[PDB]
Amino acid sequence: VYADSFVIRGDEVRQIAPGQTGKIADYNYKLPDDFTGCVIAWNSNNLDSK
Amino acid sequence: RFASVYAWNRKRISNCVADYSVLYNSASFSTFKCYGVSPTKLNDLCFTN
């Protein structure tokens, strides 16, 4: 199992999916079209926002 | 000025080149849902009317 963890914007979690595009999906994190796994995302606007 | 939904305004763009990548790269948009075409391939594709 490989767990890749990062932080992105609220309207950018939809970019973490095979085939999606945008700055995250073009320059930072690309997901293969045959990706088998899970994409867990949760709001954390109480610990990483000062 | 943007006309309301009941009177949506339509423009006929024709006979000019248009870099769809400038719209495709801007972060000002939230939903970019393309039906029948792929936004990446919108560049090389030459459409009519």
Side-chain angles (χ1 to χ4, degrees), chain B residues 1-10:
Chain B
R1 306 227 60 164
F2 265 69
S4 206
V5 65
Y6 90 110
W8 49 271
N9 55 266
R10 145 164 292 160

PDB file of all heavy atoms in Angstrom, chain B residues 1-10:
ATOM      1  N   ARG B   1     -21.536  43.558 -17.537  1.00  0.00           N
ATOM      2  CA  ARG B   1     -22.969  43.336 -17.674  1.00  0.00           C
ATOM      3  C   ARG B   1     -23.225  41.922 -18.176  1.00  0.00           C
ATOM      4  O   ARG B   1     -22.660  41.505 -19.192  1.00  0.00           O
ATOM      5  CB  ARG B   1     -23.590  44.354 -18.630  1.00  0.00           C
ATOM      6  CG  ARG B   1     -23.308  45.803 -18.267  1.00  0.00           C
ATOM      7  CD  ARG B   1     -24.577  46.637 -18.311  1.00  0.00           C
ATOM      8  NE  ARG B   1     -25.582  46.148 -17.375  1.00  0.00           N
ATOM      9  CZ  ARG B   1     -26.641  46.844 -16.981  1.00  0.00           C
ATOM     10  NH1 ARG B   1     -26.869  48.068 -17.429  1.00  0.00           N
ATOM     11  NH2 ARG B   1     -27.490  46.299 -16.115  1.00  0.00           N
ATOM     12  N   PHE B   2     -24.078  41.191 -17.460  1.00  0.00           N
ATOM     13  CA  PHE B   2     -24.458  39.830 -17.826  1.00  0.00           C
ATOM     14  C   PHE B   2     -25.975  39.731 -17.787  1.00  0.00           C
ATOM     15  O   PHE B   2     -26.586  39.903 -16.727  1.00  0.00           O
ATOM     16  CB  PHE B   2     -23.820  38.805 -16.888  1.00  0.00           C
ATOM     17  CG  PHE B   2     -22.539  38.226 -17.408  1.00  0.00           C
ATOM     18  CD1 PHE B   2     -21.399  39.005 -17.502  1.00  0.00           C
ATOM     19  CD2 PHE B   2     -22.474  36.903 -17.808  1.00  0.00           C
ATOM     20  CE1 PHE B   2     -20.219  38.475 -17.984  1.00  0.00           C
ATOM     21  CE2 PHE B   2     -21.296  36.367 -18.290  1.00  0.00           C
ATOM     22  CZ  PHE B   2     -20.168  37.155 -18.378  1.00  0.00           C
ATOM     23  N   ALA B   3     -26.581  39.458 -18.940  1.00  0.00           N
ATOM     24  CA  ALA B   3     -28.026  39.302 -19.002  1.00  0.00           C
ATOM     25  C   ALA B   3     -28.458  38.077 -18.205  1.00  0.00           C
ATOM     26  O   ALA B   3     -27.732  37.083 -18.121  1.00  0.00           O
ATOM     27  CB  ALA B   3     -28.485  39.182 -20.455  1.00  0.00           C
ATOM     28  N   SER B   4     -29.646  38.156 -17.612  1.00  0.00           N
ATOM     29  CA  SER B   4     -30.112  37.104 -16.725  1.00  0.00           C
ATOM     30  C   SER B   4     -30.416  35.830 -17.511  1.00  0.00           C
ATOM     31  O   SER B   4     -30.387  35.801 -18.745  1.00  0.00           O
ATOM     32  CB  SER B   4     -31.344  37.566 -15.950  1.00  0.00           C
ATOM     33  OG  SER B   4     -31.453  36.870 -14.723  1.00  0.00           O
ATOM     34  N   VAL B   5     -30.715  34.759 -16.770  1.00  0.00           N
ATOM     35  CA  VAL B   5     -30.880  33.444 -17.384  1.00  0.00           C
ATOM     36  C   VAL B   5     -32.081  33.417 -18.321  1.00  0.00           C
ATOM     37  O   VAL B   5     -32.051  32.741 -19.357  1.00  0.00           O
ATOM     38  CB  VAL B   5     -30.975  32.354 -16.295  1.00  0.00           C
ATOM     39  CG1 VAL B   5     -32.226  32.530 -15.446  1.00  0.00           C
ATOM     40  CG2 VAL B   5     -30.938  30.969 -16.921  1.00  0.00           C
ATOM     41  N   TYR B   6     -33.149  34.147 -17.990  1.00  0.00           N
ATOM     42  CA  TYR B   6     -34.320  34.171 -18.859  1.00  0.00           C
ATOM     43  C   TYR B   6     -34.040  34.870 -20.182  1.00  0.00           C
ATOM     44  O   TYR B   6     -34.808  34.694 -21.135  1.00  0.00           O
ATOM     45  CB  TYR B   6     -35.495  34.848 -18.148  1.00  0.00           C
ATOM     46  CG  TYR B   6     -35.578  36.341 -18.373  1.00  0.00           C
ATOM     47  CD1 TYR B   6     -36.599  36.889 -19.137  1.00  0.00           C
ATOM     48  CD2 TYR B   6     -34.638  37.201 -17.822  1.00  0.00           C
ATOM     49  CE1 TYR B   6     -36.681  38.253 -19.348  1.00  0.00           C
ATOM     50  CE2 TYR B   6     -34.712  38.566 -18.027  1.00  0.00           C
ATOM     51  CZ  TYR B   6     -35.735  39.086 -18.790  1.00  0.00           C
ATOM     52  OH  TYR B   6     -35.813  40.444 -18.997  1.00  0.00           O
ATOM     53  N   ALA B   7     -32.967  35.651 -20.264  1.00  0.00           N
ATOM     54  CA  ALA B   7     -32.579  36.366 -21.475  1.00  0.00           C
ATOM     55  C   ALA B   7     -31.087  36.203 -21.729  1.00  0.00           C
ATOM     56  O   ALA B   7     -30.363  37.170 -21.976  1.00  0.00           O
ATOM     57  CB  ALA B   7     -32.956  37.842 -21.381  1.00  0.00           C
ATOM     58  N   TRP B   8     -30.612  34.959 -21.663  1.00  0.00           N
ATOM     59  CA  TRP B   8     -29.197  34.670 -21.866  1.00  0.00           C
ATOM     60  C   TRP B   8     -28.726  35.209 -23.210  1.00  0.00           C
ATOM     61  O   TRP B   8     -29.435  35.115 -24.216  1.00  0.00           O
ATOM     62  CB  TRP B   8     -28.955  33.163 -21.792  1.00  0.00           C
ATOM     63  CG  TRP B   8     -29.906  32.361 -22.634  1.00  0.00           C
ATOM     64  CD1 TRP B   8     -31.116  31.864 -22.252  1.00  0.00           C
ATOM     65  CD2 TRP B   8     -29.722  31.965 -24.000  1.00  0.00           C
ATOM     66  NE1 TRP B   8     -31.700  31.185 -23.294  1.00  0.00           N
ATOM     67  CE2 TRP B   8     -30.864  31.232 -24.378  1.00  0.00           C
ATOM     68  CE3 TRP B   8     -28.704  32.159 -24.938  1.00  0.00           C
ATOM     69  CZ2 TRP B   8     -31.015  30.693 -25.652  1.00  0.00           C
ATOM     70  CZ3 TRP B   8     -28.858  31.623 -26.203  1.00  0.00           C
ATOM     71  CH2 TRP B   8     -30.004  30.899 -26.549  1.00  0.00           C
ATOM     72  N   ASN B   9     -27.528  35.789 -23.228  1.00  0.00           N
ATOM     73  CA  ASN B   9     -27.042  36.478 -24.418  1.00  0.00           C
ATOM     74  C   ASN B   9     -26.099  35.575 -25.200  1.00  0.00           C
ATOM     75  O   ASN B   9     -25.203  34.954 -24.620  1.00  0.00           O
ATOM     76  CB  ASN B   9     -26.353  37.796 -24.055  1.00  0.00           C
ATOM     77  CG  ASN B   9     -25.234  37.618 -23.057  1.00  0.00           C
ATOM     78  OD1 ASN B   9     -25.438  37.751 -21.850  1.00  0.00           O
ATOM     79  ND2 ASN B   9     -24.035  37.342 -23.555  1.00  0.00           N
ATOM     80  N   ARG B  10     -26.307  35.505 -26.514  1.00  0.00           N
ATOM     81  CA  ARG B  10     -25.582  34.597 -27.391  1.00  0.00           C
ATOM     82  C   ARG B  10     -24.772  35.387 -28.410  1.00  0.00           C
ATOM     83  O   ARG B  10     -25.262  36.366 -28.984  1.00  0.00           O
ATOM     84  CB  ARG B  10     -26.551  33.651 -28.113  1.00  0.00           C
ATOM     85  CG  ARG B  10     -26.149  33.292 -29.535  1.00  0.00           C
ATOM     86  CD  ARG B  10     -26.920  32.085 -30.038  1.00  0.00           C
ATOM     87  NE  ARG B  10     -26.546  30.861 -29.340  1.00  0.00           N
ATOM     88  CZ  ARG B  10     -27.294  29.767 -29.297  1.00  0.00           C
ATOM     89  NH1 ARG B  10     -28.469  29.708 -29.899  1.00  0.00           N
ATOM     90  NH2 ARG B  10     -26.848  28.704 -28.634  1.00  0.00           N
TER      91      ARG B  10
END
